[PDB]
Design a binder for these strands. Sequence first.
RNA 1: CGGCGCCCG
RNA 2: ACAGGGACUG
DNA 3: CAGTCCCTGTTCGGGCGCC
Lengths: 555, 412
Amino acid sequence: VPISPIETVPVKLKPGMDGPKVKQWPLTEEKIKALVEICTEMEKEGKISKIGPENPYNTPVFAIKKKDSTKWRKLVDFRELNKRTQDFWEVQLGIPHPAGLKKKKSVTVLDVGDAYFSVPLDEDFRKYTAFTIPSINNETPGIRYQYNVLPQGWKGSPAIFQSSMTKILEPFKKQNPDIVIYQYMDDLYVGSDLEIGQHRTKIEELRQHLLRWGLTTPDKKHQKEPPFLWMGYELHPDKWTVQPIVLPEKDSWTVNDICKLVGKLNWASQIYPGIKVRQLSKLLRGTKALTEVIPLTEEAELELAENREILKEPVHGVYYDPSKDLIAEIQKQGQGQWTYQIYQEPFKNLKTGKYARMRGAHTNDVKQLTEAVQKITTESIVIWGKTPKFKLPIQKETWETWWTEYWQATWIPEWEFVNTPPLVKLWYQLEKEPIVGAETFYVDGAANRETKLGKAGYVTNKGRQKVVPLTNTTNQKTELQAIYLALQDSGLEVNIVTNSQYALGIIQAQPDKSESELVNQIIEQLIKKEKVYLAWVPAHKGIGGNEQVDKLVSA
Amino acid sequence: PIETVPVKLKPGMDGPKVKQWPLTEEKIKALVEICTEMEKEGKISKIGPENPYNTPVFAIKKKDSTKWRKLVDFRELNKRTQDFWEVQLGIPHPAGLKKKKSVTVLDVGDAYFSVPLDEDFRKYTAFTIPSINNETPGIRYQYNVLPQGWKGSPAIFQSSMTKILEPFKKQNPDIVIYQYMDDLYVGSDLEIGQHRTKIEELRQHLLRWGLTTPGYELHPDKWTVQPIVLPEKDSWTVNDIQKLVGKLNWASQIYPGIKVRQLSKLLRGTKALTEVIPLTEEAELELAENREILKEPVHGVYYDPSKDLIAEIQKQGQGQWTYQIYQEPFKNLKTGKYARMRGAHTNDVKQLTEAVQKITTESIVIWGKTPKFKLPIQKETWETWWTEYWQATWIPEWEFVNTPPLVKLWYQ
RNA sequence: CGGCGCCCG
RNA sequence: ACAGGGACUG
DNA sequence: CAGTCCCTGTTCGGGCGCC
Ligand SMILES: Cc1ccnc2c1NC(=O)c1cccnc1N2C1CC1
Ligand SMILES: [Mn+2]
């Protein structure tokens, strides 16, 4: 007889599959003689057993190394068993962000020892565990055994651990409503607004409750260690910060340097306000090798500079005070880049961040703002579970005009205007109705698919005509091109009539920036003009002076 | 201790592994208090990591209600139980339900908590109550009883339902009663006073047979269809003739007897848009004959039960929305318009959420089926707030669309 | 070896 | 990598 | 009809930021 610590969680196998039988795979020759002994230890503790006949099971060994150890950590490879083992609902959905934590007066960390080997494996599944690994080099053929607990590198070790531990904690917690716990791996962090000593009262009383379940809590445990260092974070009960960031000063610039660079800037951007990656990010476009050589442009360096000066002075985040409102304010940073700060009390920030993503082939500041506002709302719901007060560089009339004209359903939640320049504006509007006393340019364009060759032009009510030959082009590009001409050759006020569904779709969505130089130019001409009217008439319907410019360019 | 109707994921497909989306703290409180109380009632119970299945859940308050109703998005499960409900047991859809002067919708879903569920199936109803900021892990449950909003729940309860109702149908034969998922549709030509009385009465029926029921009226006899109509003009600019002609070209995709010939000829030279061109008589008559073909129905558009319905919504501006229901292009089963819905003039997503609900509703009263939406919205916008404005116990299917406005010409 | 988050086909 | 829409091929 | 492309916008295989 062995003994029985804590409730076991049933595990099946993907129906119609069975335990593995495998040949060994290389692992370093020196440390493994040690486990021959360590194995006998486990025999006595209940973490191992053996039987001769019943196991058609064998597993190899493949491992991962960790820095900062005063002792070596053993491993075994169940990968064949793994692939053959039922799936679980993973318990780690990702991790809480510091800015979502409430400030807690007292916060301690107990690190659970022998955590994975402290959890009973499912009785009947125990069978599938049998394994073998080289003695020192090797001499005689060998022997084998079975596992009584959660094995290293097994899938359920993490799932079942997390759940069992949680299951254990539930009754302490129900008995202690005003404590606050969080579990990451084998470490537990506990915190309260109670007084420092009675807090330590419950800290021992809990090391008690864990012991009552066979869970070890050493005294290497620290009330005196905080800040706790966790995943790039430094956490004190009063204030949090990113762990110190080292920005490369290298004279030599390879694309992998710029990569690590960018990732680092964004990670800084969660806390240090106003980080810009745009120009550094332009270098990265369409490169074959991660080891290639790239020079830095002047803009990207003036930016890298401003950023280095951002990192110069230190910074810290506050924590969330659920009693008080959440405020998120976005300032337009230009080049389709955006920044935001979320604070409650002014100038004490919970966090910052960037939204730079240029979304779409042609876009504008209203669309893009709407996007930043959505990103932030989503993030806010993840962390604080609520939506912020918006402080937005946009007049309530700017915005109203946009969302109310636009064909898509679009919305920003409750928000208030902040008059911080540059302010977001609509750079042109298309008229909703034809313009009296403007020339009417009937415009068309066509190209030939085979030759990729073509022409763009127009006819007007005034007799004015034009046709321009174009090389290496498409039907679409010519229809944009003809509308363009009609913009160029027209007065301040002009009516433009086009037959292209494509072109009309772009312009009518009022882009202020585009990937396409021709659209940028169209946009530019558009801003200059006092009034524009875009009209659509079906092709080859024998329309208007539309049949005429269609003839003119199809020739 | 009563039987349990075994249930099966139609052959080949696994249980829903679909992920739980992040919730507001508000809604997480309401869900926690509802599941702990419902666990206490043994409707649901806690589960472990051995059940690797999930259905997403959130919560809503029904229209005009300050009490929180839990809502599970069982769409994925319903897709994976489907052959079971559709192929095994069919439910005839009353064609008269739509003709009734009033139709009330009562939420009977609570009754579903009576019947047990096949112990072998329960592992597929697994749903996570999320935690804010991932401070705790999820509280995972699974449904012990017949889970609200799964298509099997209204299916399996069919016998019992037809039973409890048989007294009323027998006493009131002229009253039409239809059932779609967690909702029950009841309608009659009675004057509203006595209708509401017959409704309170039916409420009693299900009340004494052991059910609780936390206005709902619809007026299907009043539902109007929006036909396409060409403008009435005193005097015509060129531009008018052009937009007219373009529209005519579309309608001619729908009604084939349309001709643009004489209006096109009206456009003959290269003319200023705003110049005023008089209507020739031959054209005046082609146009009036067109205004005619547009008062007709469309030959050969009829509902085919086997086909999925598809519903398209266009945003027309200024609180207006147009919609069209069809199973196949250009053969439209219904066209319509909504205005001054909640959110009008301030929040588009709200209005749209409303439109999707009203449309699904007419769709259920008429064909007994929820439509597939094409939503004139960005995917992400929609996911964020659609979860915020939802008052219905069901969830239609949707996909996201971009059609800068030339079909916006479904209304002047 | 993975999870989580961005950038390129 | 996948889909929707346009337009041209007899 | 299918069968061609031209243009545009969300899922998966490369690599950096955090374990
Ligand atoms: C790393 C971590 C993750 C999640 N929560 C906590 C912690 N540890 C803390 O440093 C912490 C700090 C301040 C307040 N709560 C904290 N806690 C909460 C549990 C009391
Ligand atoms: Mn053309």
